[PDB]
Structure 1
Amino acid sequence: EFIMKTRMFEEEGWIRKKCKVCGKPFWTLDPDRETCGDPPCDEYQFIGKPGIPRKYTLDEMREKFLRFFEKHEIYPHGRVKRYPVLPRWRDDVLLVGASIMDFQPWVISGEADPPANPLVISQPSIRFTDIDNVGITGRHFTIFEMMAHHAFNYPGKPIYWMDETVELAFEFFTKELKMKPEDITFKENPWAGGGNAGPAFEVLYRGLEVATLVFMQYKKKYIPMETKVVDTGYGLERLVWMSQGTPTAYDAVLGYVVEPLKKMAGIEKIDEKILMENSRLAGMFDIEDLGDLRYLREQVAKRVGITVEELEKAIRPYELIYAIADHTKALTFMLADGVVPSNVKAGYLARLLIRKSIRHLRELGLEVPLSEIVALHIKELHKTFPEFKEMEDIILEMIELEEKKYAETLRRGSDLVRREIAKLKKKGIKEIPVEKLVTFYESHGLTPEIVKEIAEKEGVKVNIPDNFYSMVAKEAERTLVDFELLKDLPDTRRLYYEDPFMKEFDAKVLRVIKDWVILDATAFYPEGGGQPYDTGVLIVNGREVKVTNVQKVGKVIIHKVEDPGAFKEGMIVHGKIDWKRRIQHMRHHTGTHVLMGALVRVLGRHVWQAGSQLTTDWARLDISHYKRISEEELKEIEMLANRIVMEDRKVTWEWLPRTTAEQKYGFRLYQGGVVPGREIRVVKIEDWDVQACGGTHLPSTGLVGPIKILRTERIQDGVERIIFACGE
């Protein structure tokens, strides 16, 4: 069904072929190539023979890729600062897994401009599905950099497409990296991606997939997208490995940690051969899970000429160290970018990495706190990611707390499981199924190695699944008032955005549905952003009718009134807001913002809203934080907040197109989560705090009055709550 002719292929005489092994179509310059270049059709040919003529470091390659595309004479790209691995701009994924995710949904739908079109980027990406392969295959990482040039072809506005994309790739590979042209293949491999799909190439060189070229043009035959998006992905680590020729990708990227851990653990350094042959066959042979670690192991055993026991003896220490190295790097990005360990979402993933890593250290027989290993990452990488230096104290503290709290979790967890194993055993069970091993982790925090020595110690079975961790990983992703009769109406003019001191107004009745009145313009605040609705009255025929609720549906606001029969379509009414109720909310809402700037500064940049609610008497703010707020910190925050009131800084607002706002102010805007619209409403407290926000704010901080913090409470692991009161 899929085409894939390109101008380059035609002009340069590339041949389209069906692979003899996988049957799939691929393009080649080699008249003698019969296979697609992709394991198991072909094999890694570069271990001990770098296929890139000179050795590169991560830093060297990243810059090389970014430079080439930035300085291109026919298609220059804007260079774009990587985004956090924690997607603040969307609420549907836990972690960034791919550079394209920076630009979903808003840029692709056209609702937000690209930062630059076309753009070039190097995006740290995290993938938990490969986790059980890390340190075992020689090429899988939790955390890796995806380099990409992207182009967003909006209708009427071509940038570039397939012809240019494969010319660009081929140029970068052949002119910049000096790879052999007759050794590169472009394999056709249609792509489906959840939401959308299109034709794709895999670029293959000496058996390694060095790049993915994807042309998005269908969304959920399927259904053709309006915007055509060039979505590339080049693996930094794979490219570095292709230039080093080391027995594993880990020795090429994580040396600064692999070696230190070998020395400390003091481990009998392996026959290099075994490590080379493992990676070789691990290519040819995916862990499609099932039970095939055991077939991989048997295979490398026969090739090196030893038993699986002596193999396991020799490799395991390497497997452990590779995994610790990878997992700690991933935890540095995650924590730096704002992940607080916990039992939910990315906190749960951070916690999983911490616990998995600690157990690897214990299986090595290494007595070294995990934080020390993170420190190595901070030392090597802060040059190119300054944020690691800035966050260092918080990152290391979070690790130490988790390490310390893990030691207790384990003693009481051991006792608790041992008892419920014995229960299962006198219930005629001698196995323990996947599901229950998962639950043991999920609710007692024990990893399957621990369970098994407890279990076999009273006649019950260990059977740790090869894919245990990628399983547990899947768990992190847990889980109308008035409709449609509105769509045909104009957006309500929000007078409270023009003047948040407007207490009276005039307007025209557009609809009366049941007991909700709909105006053409209103100064009544609709519920949202933790700010309750205004109340007040509407006046019609000299008849005052109380407003008791004010909600928003799309862009149309509805007023709940006590007497719907007083109003008819076309009637002119006189609005009058309850000023006391409004003024107390304004104080609490702006207070909440004064607060957030104080919390961030006293606790740290990882501080993110998690919940927020205000009333006429008190407000509360829930935040992501990794420990109790101490009495002293409480007072430190209250002081700092009160200093900003007394200082009377300007509070201002403006609308900005989404990508502009983000690029000026960073992703801190997205506190209450994420807001639709081509343009967003930015509330700013001068040199203090800045937020994408819908509510009504005071012009000045002075107008908030004294801010008294009432108390603090834990809500759950990772979430602390602060309750305060504003005004004199």
Structure 2
Amino acid sequence: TLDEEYLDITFLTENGFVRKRCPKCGKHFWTADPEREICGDPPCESYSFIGNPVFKKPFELDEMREYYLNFFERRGHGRIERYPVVARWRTDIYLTIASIADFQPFVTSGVAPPPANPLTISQPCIRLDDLDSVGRTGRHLTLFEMMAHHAFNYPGKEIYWKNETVAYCTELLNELGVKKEDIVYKEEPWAGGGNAGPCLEAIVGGLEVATLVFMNLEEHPEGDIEIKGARYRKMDNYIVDTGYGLERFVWASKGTPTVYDAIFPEVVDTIIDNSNVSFNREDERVRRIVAESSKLAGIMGELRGERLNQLRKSVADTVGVSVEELEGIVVPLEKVYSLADHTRCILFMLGDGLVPSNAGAGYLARLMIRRSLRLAEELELGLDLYDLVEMHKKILGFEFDVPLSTVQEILELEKERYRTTVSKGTRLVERLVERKKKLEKDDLIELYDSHGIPVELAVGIAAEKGAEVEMPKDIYAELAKRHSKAEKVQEKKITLQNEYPATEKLYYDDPTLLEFEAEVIGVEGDFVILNRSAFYPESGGQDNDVGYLIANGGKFEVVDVLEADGVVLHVVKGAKPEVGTKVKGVIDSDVRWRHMRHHSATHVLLYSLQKVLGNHVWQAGARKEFSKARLDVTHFRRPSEEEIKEIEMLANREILANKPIKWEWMDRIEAERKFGFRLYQGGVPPGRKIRVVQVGDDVQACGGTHCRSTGEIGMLKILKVESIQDGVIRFEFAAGEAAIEAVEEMERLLREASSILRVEPAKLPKTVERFFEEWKDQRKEIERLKSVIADLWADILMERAEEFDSMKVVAEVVDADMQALQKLAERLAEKGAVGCLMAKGEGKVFVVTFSGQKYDARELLREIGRVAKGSGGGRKDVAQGAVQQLLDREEMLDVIFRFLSEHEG
């Protein structure tokens, strides 16, 4: 089945390679060396290159990049400069995980042409899955550059297939110098990004250096072929993908112990020299143990547990090192690398415009910051993360859209935030100890999953305090991952009951027209469809163009209009003319104008937002209703009043400039070349051609209706600024007359309030404060006076209290509300009275009982309830409740005596 693909490869059989199989029932693979065998012990060999350059000469990062790019430039394929590490153009995935991910999936589905063919690129990529592996395996990074050649093939016409792909790999390595006998081609199944295919993964010197995937299939519901839990289907067209790890590539050029040393030596050095590490990097014994341990690092990743300690023993003896000695170096190093790597990863994340958050894309950046800070704390680093990030910056020497200054601010803020959280969380744990005297796992998940507190802090406080502990691993995911239920399975929009072809809208090129000439094709329920619509349908925000539709008979009312694919729907809550009529649709001007203005204003505010705040801001979302509009952007903190005032100002300045607005349909490639990725702030559009709107400076892919110039949108008013989530901020605004009325309404609310207190609008806050102060004062004084009433009331009531064995009993029907009854009772109880008071209320009577002695006020109230038909409760000294039947004093006294008799001896 699958093999039929692999054996077809030309290079393997004719040029000089063979296919073989392993002892463990794992897989097939290819070699040119007919001589030697893997032991049969799972991963028998991990590395050879360590201590031995397998390249002809040590390369540096830039050198490797250029050697690769030009080797490939000379040979017939176009160079394309890298994409950002953030998948702005995609929705399905946050960050760039592979080189192929750049062009996915419109280009890979044939929908759009690649910018060149074949092409090549050193594309940075981020994987966060291998987080456990990183710093321990010696070959993994969170952030790396993956370089590629991609050839895009259509049925009958293909630049190249498998043969040139494998060829290029073999010739590239050979030009470097590694003999064909030393390169091993492992076959494997490759899936990811909605596309997939079989892949030859090149390992040399024991290290996977490369992977070339042959994309034959795509993710699809039918899913005849199944893999990685996902469903896939054979394509009509095929694409080649080629991943080459540079960081690993330079590593095999230097033969250093770990890739980290090969890529950023100086950073690792800075960390180790300014830390709490016991040892020195220089001396022999730590050099020997690192050399040999590095050799087995590629093994230790795959094998863990009992074997891990066993292999640790094997290498410990190999170097002649105690059980405690080696991991005394291995463990701190495993953290040093992780920290060094993460800092490099932080760099690209922030620099490419990703803003830390508590959810969504930004949370990833936050996470990396968090971990970096934990590691920094554990190493007692004498520097701040910013220093390390700056080092990586100089070292790689790249240039970013986001300034390093903003990066520092973000690091400082995120750090300070974390410090706040660990503080508050810590204090909580202390309270938890005092309350429960022991820590349990079910609470432990809450500590991390809902307070962001690592178990090492919980256990590291409980043990610090002697509190009981249970630390169960492998369960952190157990609850969050395994309980989750989706509601709807089928497609997003409501599917048609019948198809209509040739639907189109000519409001794109021309927006001055509300009017148009057309014919009608279809009618369903309370909503109808036509052939050419000036009618723009409603978005998530109201985005709706009202109007009417004249018939050849009468004027019929469009109350609302939506959209289906290749269809425009017009909801009419009145009579339906049916298929017969030939019709001119006439759209209301005021709405078209207002929506135009709010669209253009949306763009203007975005433009103003980036210029005032920084390049790191990107539209997270946007929606609009009647007399209101909103725009979500990425910013690490709610702006100060100054900052938003200036934003308002600059926005209005942009209005008064009255700059021209131009929008032109175009193919995706040319647009992407022209403007950068700021084009996709409004989402990613389907189709071969896109509608490009240019508001003079800010350019974006928008299907929305727009003004001719900016002078038309009128003034712009920011209505409300709120921080949705950390790192995302919503701006509520209005423009045109929808703003002036929004202002006028605002004026009203002021005047009205002023008029109520008969005072000048300017002095409203000062008078309202004065009142509020007086209001609190008066509210208090009443509480004092009410206490006086009660105290006086008590003494009045005891004077007439019948005595009962040196106790004074009181039972009356008073004139007071429940709170007064209660305060009175509390006073009587304090003075050792016994009895109950009642008061006429509302559809009920309020009962209060009381005792200042051994007698329980609750039991007395239940007895009162039996005679008066009602229920309540309270404490030993007072009890509150309600009854339906008011009682005479005599009847109440009967009961009290009956109660008092029960309880002496």
Q: Give the SS at the match of 2:403.
A: helix
Deviations 1:454-499 (A, max 9, x none): 233343335374897x999989x9986742224x212432132132
Deviations 1:131-161 (A, max 9, x none): 1122122211100111111111112321101
1:143 is aligned to 143
Distance 1:326 1:38 in 2: 32
SS in 2 for 1:541: coil
Q: Unpaired runs of 5+ in structure 1?
A: none
Are 1:693 and 2:708 an aligned pair? no
| Contact in 2 for aligned 1:528/1:695 (Cα 8 Å) | no
The answer to whether structure 1 residue 347 and structure 2 residue 383 are counterparts is no
Aligned pairs for 1:159-174 (under 5 A) are: 159-174=159-174
- Displacement after TM superposition at 1:513 (Å): 0.7
Change (3 A) 1:497 1:337: same
Tell me if structure 1 keeps the 8 A contact 2:635–2:727. yes
Question: How many angstroms does 1:36 deviate by?
Answer: 10
- SS at the partner of 2:139? coil
Structural RMSD (CA): 2.7
Q: Which residue of 1 is the match for residue 329 of structure 2?
A: 314
Which residue in the other structure is 1:613 paired with?
Answer: 623
Q: Which moved more, 1:567-576 or 1:239-248?
A: 567-576
Q: What secondary structure does 1:606 align onto?
A: coil
Distance 1:471 1:62 in 2: 42
Evaluate the alpha carbon distance shift between residue 533 and residue 368 of structure 1 in structure 2; reply closer, same or farther with a 3 A threshold.
same
Quote the residue 1:622 is aligned against.
632
Match of residue 510, structure 2, among 485, 499, 511: 499
CA contact (8 A) 1:137 1:278 kept: no
Distance 1:291 1:636 in 2: 63
- Is 1:19 the equivalent of 2:22? yes
Matches within 5 A, 1:420-435: 420=432, 432=441
**Alpha carbons 1:512, 1:569 under 8 Å: kept:** yes
Distance in structure 1 (CA, Å) of the matches to 2:240 and 2:525? 49
Q: In structure 1, what is the equivalent of residue 400 of structure 2?
A: 387
1:242 and 2:252 aligned: yes
How far apart, CA to CA, are the structure 2 residues paired with 1:119 and 1:608? 29
Which whole-Å CA distance do the structure 1 matches of 2:493 and 2:559 have between them?
Answer: 15
Percent identity between the aligned chains? 50
Residue deviations 1:83-131 (CA, integer Å, cap 9, x gap): 1111011111121111111122111111121121111111111111111
Q: Secondary structure at the match of 2:516?
A: strand
Give the number of aligned pairs. Answer: 711
CA separation in 1, counterparts of 2:23 and 2:366? 46
Cα separation, partners in 2 of 1:244 and 1:472, compared to 1, 3 Å: farther
CA, structure 1 residues 550+80, in 2 after alignment: closer, same or farther (shift >3 Å)?
same
Quickly say closer, same or farther: Cα 1:194–1:617, change in 2 above 3 A. Answer: closer
**Contact 2:117 2:152 (C-alpha < 8 Å) held by counterparts:** yes
Q: Distance in 1 between matches of 2:91 and 2:329?
A: 44
- Find the aligned partners of 1:292 and 1:36 in 2 and give their Cα distance: 17
Q: Distance in 2 between matches of 1:392 and 1:448?
A: 33
Kept after mapping to 2: 8 A contact 1:38/1:207: no
- Paired amino acid for 2:601: G
Q: Which residue in the other structure is 2:185 paired with?
A: 186
Contact 1:581 1:616 in 2 (8 A): no
Please state if 1:665 is matched with 2:675: yes
Instruction: Specify the SS of the correspondent of 1:611.
Output: strand
Of residues 538, 541, 544, the one that matches 1:533 is 544
- C-alpha separation between the residues in 2 aligned to 1:83 and 1:293? 40
Displacement of 1:585 after TM fit? Answer: 1.2
Using the alignment, how far apart are the partners of 1:467 and 1:130 within structure 2?
18
**Alpha-carbon distance change, 13 to 370 in structure 1, aligned in 2, over 3 angstroms:** closer
Q: What is the letter of the counterpart of residue 344 of structure 2?
A: K
SS in 2 for 1:362: helix
Q: Residues 341-367 of structure 1: CA distance to partner in whole angstroms, max 9, x if unpaired?
A: 112133111111111111111111224
Q: Counterpart amino acid of 2:179?
A: K
Equivalent position of 2:392 in the other structure: 377
Give the match for residue 613 of structure 2.
Answer: 603
Counterparts in 2 of 1:481 and 1:216: CA distance versus 1, 3 Å: closer
Which of 1 and 2 has higher RCO (CA within 8 Å, sep 6+)? 1
Residue 324 of structure 1: how far off its partner (Å): 1.2
Question: In the alignment, which residue of structure 2 is the partner of 1:226?
Answer: 236
In 2: Cα distance, 1:119 partner to 1:410 partner: 48
1:114 aligns with 2:133: no
Letter in 1 for 2:89: W
SS at match of 1:446: coil
C-alpha change, 1:105 and 1:638, in structure 2 (3 Å) is: same
Match of 2:788 in 1: none
Could you tell me how far apart the structure 2 residues matched to 1:422 and 1:478 are?
Answer: 37
**How far apart are the structure 2 equivalents of 1:264 and 1:94?**
35
> What do the CA deviations read for 1:219-266 (whole angstroms, capped 9, x no partner)?
335242111111110100111110111111111111131111122226
In structure 2, how many angstroms separate the alpha carbons of the residues matched to 1:137 and 1:280? 10
Name the aligned partner's letter for residue 506 of structure 1. Answer: E
Are 1:411 and 2:423 counterparts? yes
Matched, 1:453 2:460: yes
Q: Which amino acid aligns with 1:725?
A: A
After superposition, the Cα gap between the structure-2 partners of 1:631 and 1:131, relative to the gap in structure 1 and judged at 3 Å, is same
**AA aligned opposite 2:421:** T
Residues 613 and 197 of structure 1: CA distance in aligned 2, closer, same or farther (over 3 Å): closer
Question: Structure 1 residues 681 and 296 mapped into 2: Cα distance closer, same or farther (>3 Å)?
Answer: farther
Q: Distance in 2 between matches of 1:373 and 1:474?
A: 34
Are the counterparts in 1 of residues 433 and 467 from structure 2 also a CA contact under 8 Å?
no
| Structure 1 residues 79 and 372: CA distance shift in structure 2, 3 A | same
**1:325–1:481 CA distance, 2 compared to 1 (3 A):** closer
Q: Deviations over 1:48-86 (max 9, x none)?
A: 1111121111111111111111111xxx11111111111
One-letter amino acid of the counterpart of residue 440, structure 1: L
CA distance in 1, matches of 2:356, 2:46: 40
Q: Determine helix, strand or coil for the equivalent of 2:621.
A: strand
The separation in 2 between residues aligned to 1:29 and 1:641, in whole angstroms, is 67
> 1:269-284, aligned counterparts within 5 Å?
269=280, 271-284=286-299
Distance 1:251 1:371, change over 3 A: same
Structure 2 gaps of 5+ residues are 226-232, 487-491, 738-905
Measure, in 2, the Cα distance between the counterparts of 1:50 and 1:465. 40
Number of the residue aligned with 2:832: none
**SS, match of residue 147 in structure 1:** strand
Alignment correspondent of 2:345: 330
Give the counterpart of 2:32 among 24, 29, 32: 29
Deviation at 1:453, TM superposition (A): 0.5
Structure 1 CA distance for aligned equivalents of residues 78 and 456 of structure 2: 49
Match of 1:509 among 505, 513, 520: 520
TM-score for the superposition, normalised by structure 1? 0.92
2:517 match: secondary structure: strand
Q: Aligned-pair distance for 1:441?
A: 2.8
- 8 Å contact kept, 1:653–1:683: yes
Q: In the TM superposition, what whole-angstrom CA distance separates every residue of 1:266-319 from its partner, at most 9, and x where no partner exists?
A: 642251122222222221233477787656645543433334433232233322
CA distance in structure 2 between the partners assigned to 1:181 and 1:104 by the alignment: 33
Judge conservation of contact 2:48–2:205 (CA < 8 Å) in 1.
yes
| Corresponding letter in the other structure for 2:379 | L
SS in 2 for 1:357: helix
| Other-structure match for 2:56 | 53
Secondary structure at 1:640 match in 2: helix
Aligned CA distance change for structure 1 residues 699 and 308 (closer, same or farther; 3 Å): farther
Closer, same or farther in 2 for the Cα pair 1:197/1:724, shift >3 Å?
closer
SS at 1:136's partner residue? coil
Q: Distance in 1 between matches of 2:714 and 2:389?
A: 44
Give the aligned partner of residue 262 of structure 1.
272
SS at match of 2:124: strand
Partners in 2 of 1:129 and 1:24 — Cα distance? 24
Whether 2:15 is the aligned partner of 1:7: answer no
In 2: Cα distance, 1:173 partner to 1:473 partner: 45
Per-residue deviation, residues 192-219 of structure 1 (Å, max 9, x unmatched) = 4474442211112111111111111133
Are 1:718 and 2:722 an aligned pair? Answer: no
Preserved contact between residue 378 and residue 392 of structure 1 (Cα < 8 Å): no
Q: 2:357, 2:620 → 1: CA distance?
A: 13
Instruction: Report the counterpart of residue 574 of structure 2 in structure 1.
Output: 563
